[PDB]
C-alpha cells in the first residue's frame, strides 16, 4: 500500500474474491442446496412446489426448468444450473430434474476426488471418456422398433405417453391423455414418419370445468363472439355443398382510402352528394362480392364499423372482429384455405372448408369462445384442455407440451430405451469394469462417475420409501447374473423389477442427453478457480 490508495479495478471495496479450496466448497455446496430441492421432486412419487412471483402470481410446478426459472438466486453456480434445466426443456423437453441431480451427483463425487489431489482436467477428461463409452455401449444394446407395423408403433407412443404424463398431475385421466396425445400426432404427421412440424400444434388452456370435460377438436380457438348476436349461434352448412366455404380477409370493411395521408376536397354540393353515393355503393358492392363468392362465415383482421352488421345479418352471414394475425396463420392451415388480400382478388378457390361452426357458454358470464371442428384428417390439432383451477390448467399445458415433445423424439427413427433406473445402472457397472484394466491415474475418476449414475435409482428409493442399499444390491447382482438390461426400479410397486412388461420407455436421445449436459457443465464448473462477484 505504502500509504497511497492502492486501487486497480473500479469499485474496489464492493466486489470480493475467492480462491483455493474454499472456492470449490462454495460451488459443491451450492449444487447440493439446489439438488435437495430437485431430489425430493424427481420420480413418480415426487411432490409439486409453489413458486411465488414478485407480482403475487403463483405456479404449482414439479418440473425443474419452471422451478429454477422463477427462482430468484444470487449464486452464479445455481444460475448455470438454471440454464442447464432450461437447455433440456427447450430442445428435448424431458429430464430437466434429472440433469440437475445428475450434474450434482458428478459434482458431489468430484468433491471426494479433489480431496485426494487429482487435477480438475484429469477429472473432466475422465467423465468425457466415460460418457462417450457409456453412450457407445447403450447405443448397441437398445433395439429398433421400425421393423414393426403402424399398429404396434402406436403402442410404443402409448408406452412413452403414460411415462411422461405420470409424475405429473394429469395422472388420473392419464389413460385418456395418452390416447389424446397419440391421437393428436396421428392427424399431424408426415407420410414417411419423419420430421413432423411441431409448430402446427399450439397450446391453449381454459380456466373452468373439470378434467373429464376435456376432449379433442380439430380447429381454432378464438376468444370472441360473432358480430351483433341476433343470428343463431350454431350455423349449419347447406343441404348440398362441399362445405361452409370459409372466407378470411385482411382488409376492414370500409371505403377504399389511401395508406398515405390524403385531403379529399369537395368544392360543390353536387360532389358532396356523389360522396354520399360513393359511400353507399362501396358497401353495396362489398356485400355483393362476398355474396357471389358463396362464403357463409367471414373472418376480418382489422375489424369493421357497425354499418356492416345489418348487411351481414340479413344475408345470413356471421362475422367476427379484431382477429389477430397470428390466429389467421392458424386458420389458413387448418381449413386449407388461402387468405385473399382484397375483394377484387376474391375467388372461390381460395376459400377454406370446415365441418361446422358453433359456440357455447362454459358457465354464466365468462366469455364467448369460438370453436371450429373438421370432418376429416387435417394438418392442425388444437388441444382443448379444461381445469378446475388456473394452476391446474397451467400445469396441464406444460405437462401435455412435454408429452408431445416425448412423442416428437420417437418420430426420429431407432431411438428407444427402457428407463425406470435401468438405463443408469446398466451404464454404471460397465464403467467400473473398464476401470479395472484402464486403471492409470483416472481409476477413481471412473468410479466417481459409476457411483454418480447410481444416485438416480437411490433418489427413486428415497421418494418411494424403500431401502436404497437393498435396491441397488439387487439390481447390480441381477445385471451381473443376466445380461438382460431392461430391469429397473419400479416405484408404483406393481411387482416385478422387470420393465418391458410394465411398459416404461423413455427416448434414447433424451437419456444420452442427461450425461452430456451433466458432464459438459461439470467440466465448466471444475475449471473455475477465482470467483469475483460484485455487489448489487
Amino acid at each position: 500500500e505504502m500509504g497511497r490508495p492502492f486501487i486497480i479495478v473500479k469499485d474496489q471495496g464492493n466486489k470480493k474474491r475467492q480462491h483455493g479450496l474454499e472456492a470449490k466448497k462454495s460451488h459443491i455446496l451450492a449444487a447440493r442446496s439446489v439438488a435437495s430441492i430437485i431430489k425430493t421432486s424427481l420420480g413418480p412419487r415426487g411432490l409439486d412446489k409453489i413458486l411465488i412471483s414478485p407480482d403475487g402470481e403463483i405456479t404449482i410446478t414439479n418440473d425443474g426448468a419452471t422451478i429454477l426459472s422463477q427462482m430468484e438466486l444470487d449464486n452464479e453456480i445455481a444460475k448455470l444450473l438454471v440454464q442447464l434445466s432450461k437447455s433440456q426443456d427447450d430442445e428435448i423437453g424431458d429430464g430437466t430434474t434429472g440433469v440437475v441431480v445428475l450434474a450434482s451427483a458428478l459434482l458431489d463425487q468430484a468433491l471426494e476426488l479433489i480431496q485426494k489431489g487429482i487435477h480438475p482436467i484429469k477429472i473432466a477428461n475422465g467423465f468425457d471418456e466415460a460418457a462417450k463409452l457409456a453412450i457407445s455401449k447403450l447405443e448397441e444394446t437398445c433395439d429398433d422398433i421400425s421393423a414393426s407395423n403402424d399398429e404396434l408403433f402406436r403402442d410404443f407412443l402409448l408406452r412413452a405417453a403414460k411415462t411422461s404424463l405420470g409424475s405429473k398431475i394429469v395422472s388420473k385421466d392419464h389413460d385418456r391423455f395418452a390416447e389424446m396425445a397419440v391421437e393428436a400426432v396421428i392427424n399431424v404427421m408426415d407420410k414417411d414418419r419423419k420430421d413432423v412440424d411441431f409448430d402446427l400444434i399450439k397450446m391453449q388452456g381454459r380456466v373452468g370445468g373439470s378434467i373429464s370435460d376435456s376432449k379433442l377438436i380439430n380447429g381454432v380457438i378464438l376468444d370472441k363472439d360473432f358480430s351483433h348476436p341476433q343470428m343463431p349461434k350454431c350455423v349449419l352448412p347447406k343441404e348440398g355443398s362441399d362445405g361452409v366455404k370459409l372466407a378470411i380477409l385482411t382488409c376492414p370493411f370500409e371505403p377504399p382510402k389511401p395508406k398515405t395521408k390524403h385531403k379529399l376536397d369537395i368544392s360543390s354540393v353536387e360532389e358532396y352528394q356523389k360522396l354520399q353515393t360513393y359511400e353507399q355503393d362501396k358497401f353495396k358492392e362489398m356485400i355483393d362480392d362476398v355474396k357471389k363468392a358463396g362464403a357463409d362465415v367471414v373472418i376480418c383482421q382489422w375489424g369493421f364499423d357497425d354499418e356492416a352488421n345489418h348487411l351481414l345479418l340479413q344475408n345470413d352471414l356471421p362475422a367476427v372482429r379484431w382477429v389477430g394475425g397470428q390466429e389467421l396463420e392458424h386458420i389458413a392451415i387448418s381449413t386449407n384455405g388461402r387468405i385473399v388480400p382484397r375483394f377484387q382478388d376474391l375467388s372461390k378457390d381460395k376459400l377454406g372448408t370446415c365441418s361446422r361452426i358453433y359456440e357455447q357458454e362454459f358457465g354464466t358470464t365468462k366469455d364467448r369462445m369460438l370453436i371450429i371442428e373438421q370432418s376429416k384428417e387435417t394438418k392442425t390439432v388444437t388441444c382443448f384442455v379444461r381445469g378446475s383451477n388456473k394452476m391446474i390448467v397451467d400445469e396441464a399445458e406444460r405437462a401435455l407440451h412435454d408429452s408431445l415433445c416425448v412423442v416428437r423424439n420417437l418420430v426420429k427413427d431407432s431411438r428407444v430405451v427402457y428407463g425406470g433406473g435401468a438405463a443408469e445402472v446398466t451404464m454404471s457397472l460397465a464403467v467400473s469394469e473398464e476401470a479395472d484394466k484402464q486403471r492409470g491415474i483416472d481409476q477413481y475418476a471412473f468410479r466417481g462417475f459409476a457411483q454418480a449414475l447410481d444416485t438416480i435409482p437411490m433418489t427413486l428409493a428415497e421418494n418411494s420409501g424403500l431401502d436404497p442399499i437393498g435396491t441397488l444390491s439387487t439390481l447390480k447382482s441381477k445385471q451381473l447374473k443376466e445380461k438382460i438390461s431392461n430391469i429397473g426400479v419400479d416405484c408404483l410397486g406393481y411387482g416385478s423389477n422387470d420393465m418391458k412388461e410394465l411398459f416404461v420407455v423413455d427416448p434414447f436421445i433424451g437419456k444420452k442427453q442427461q450425461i452430456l449436459l451433466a458432464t459438459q457443465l461439470c467440466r465448466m464448473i471444475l475449471k473455475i478457480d477465482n470467483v469475483i462477484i460484485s455487489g448489487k
Binding site: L29, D48, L51
Partner: protein, 518 residues
Amino acid sequence: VQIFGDQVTEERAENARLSAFVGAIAVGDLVKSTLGPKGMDKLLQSASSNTCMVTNDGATILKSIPLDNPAAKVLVNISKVQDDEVGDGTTSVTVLSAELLREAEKLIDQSKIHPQTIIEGYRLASAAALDALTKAAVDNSHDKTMFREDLIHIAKTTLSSKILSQDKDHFAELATNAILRLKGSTNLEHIQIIKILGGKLSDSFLDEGFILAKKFGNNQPKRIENAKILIANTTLDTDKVKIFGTKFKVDSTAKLAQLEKAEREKMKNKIAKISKFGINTFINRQLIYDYPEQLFTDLGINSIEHADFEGVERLALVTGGEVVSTFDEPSKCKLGECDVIEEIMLGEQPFLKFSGCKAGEACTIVLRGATDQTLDEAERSLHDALSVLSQTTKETRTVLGGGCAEMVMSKAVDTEAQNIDGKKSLAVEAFARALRQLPTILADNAGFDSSELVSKLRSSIYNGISTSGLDLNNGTIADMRQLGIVESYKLKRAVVSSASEAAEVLLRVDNIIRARPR
C-alpha cells in the same frame, strides 16, 4: 451457502405443510358460519374510500379479503371458478376442500401415510362418489309440469341460504317464470336487475316487457298505443363520413351555407326514409342531438337516446323485431310490435313501461329493498338462483339434498373401501368422513347436536331408505320429497369434482418458495 437473494423466505420442512394446512383451515373456518339456511351474513371493510360490502357468497368474500398465503390463493381460485361456472356452491367447495386437507392432516401426522397414498384413495373414492350420483339422479324431462315443479324446489333451496329465506315463496314463482321466459337461453346477461331502494322487500315484481332506465327527451308523449319499434346502431347524428381526410375547398361563405344546408338535407332525407316504415317509436344507442330530434315531432314518432349496447340485445329480444340500419330497403328488414307503452315512476327516477309484446325471450326484474346493501345482496342471490336454474334446463337431471347427497356418496364410498385391502383403505375412509362434516356444520349453524343428529341420519339410510335427510326448522329427520328441496346434477358434480381436485393441489406440496415483493 445461501444461494437465494436477500429477503427470500423458504420453508423446506414440516412447517411448510403446517403453514399450507393452517392457511386452508383459516379459510375453512372463515366460511363455516356462512353455510346453510341459518348461516350468518358477513361484513367487509374496504381499505379504499370506506366502500363497505355485505355478501354471503364465499367467492366475493375471499376475493375481497387480502391473503398472502399461497394455499389461500388455491381456495380463492377454486371459489372463483365455481362462481363463474355454476354460480352456486362456492362455500361448499371451500369448506369441503379445507376439511379434506384437515382430515388428511392427521393421516400425515398420526398414522404417517404417504401423500401419494392419500390422493390415490381419493381417486378411487371420487370415482365411486360420482357413480353414486349416476344412479341417484332422476330425469324429469318427460313432463313439463313436473319440471316446472322442479324449478320451484331448486329456487327454494338456493334462495333459502341468502337473506330472502322468508320471501323465497314469492320469488320462487318469479325465478321460474324468468327461466320459462328465456325458454332455454342460459345467458345471464339477458336479465336487467333494476336496483331501487325503499319499500317493502316483498314489493318486487316481474313485468312482461323491458323497463328502460331513461325517459323521452323533450316533448314526446308518455302514453301511446300500437307502437312499432325500430332499433338502430349507426350514428344517425351529424354524420362524419367513414374517411376523415374529407375537406371542403370553400371559395366563399355563401357556398359554405349551402354545404351545411346539404348536411341538413341528407339528414332530412335520412329521417324521411325512417317515415317510410310507418312507425311510431324509434330507438338508437347513440345519444341523439337536437336537429334529428326535432324532425320526429312532425312525423309523430317517439325518440329514445343513449341506450347501452348490452341493453340493445335485451331490447331486441323482448320486442321480437330486428335492429335495422341502411334504411333504403324496408322490405327485407323486420320490426317488432307492442300493444301499449307508458312512462312510470318508481321512486325518484322515471322509467318506461312496456307491456303486451309478442316475443317473450327476455325480461327485467325490479327489486325493492331497504338499503343498498340489502338490495345488493338480493342481486347476488337472484343471480345465484337464476344461474343454477338456467343450467338446470340444459342439465335436466337433479339430486336430492339436505344431507342425503353427501351420505349416499359415503354409502358407496365405504362399500368400496373393503375391496381395496391395504393402507389405502384409511385414505378412502378419510374421504368418507370428510363428507360427513357437511351435514355436521349445517347442524352446528342452527344450534343442534353434531353427533346424535348425524348418527340418526347414518342409521336411516343403511336400513334401506334413500330419501331421508335433515330438517332444520324442527331438528329431526324427515322426507325430502315432501319438503321439496332438490339440487341440480351439474352442481353436485361440480362441487365434488372441484373439492376433490382442490385437495390434490395442497397435498403434493412440500416446499414453499417466496421471492421478494415488487
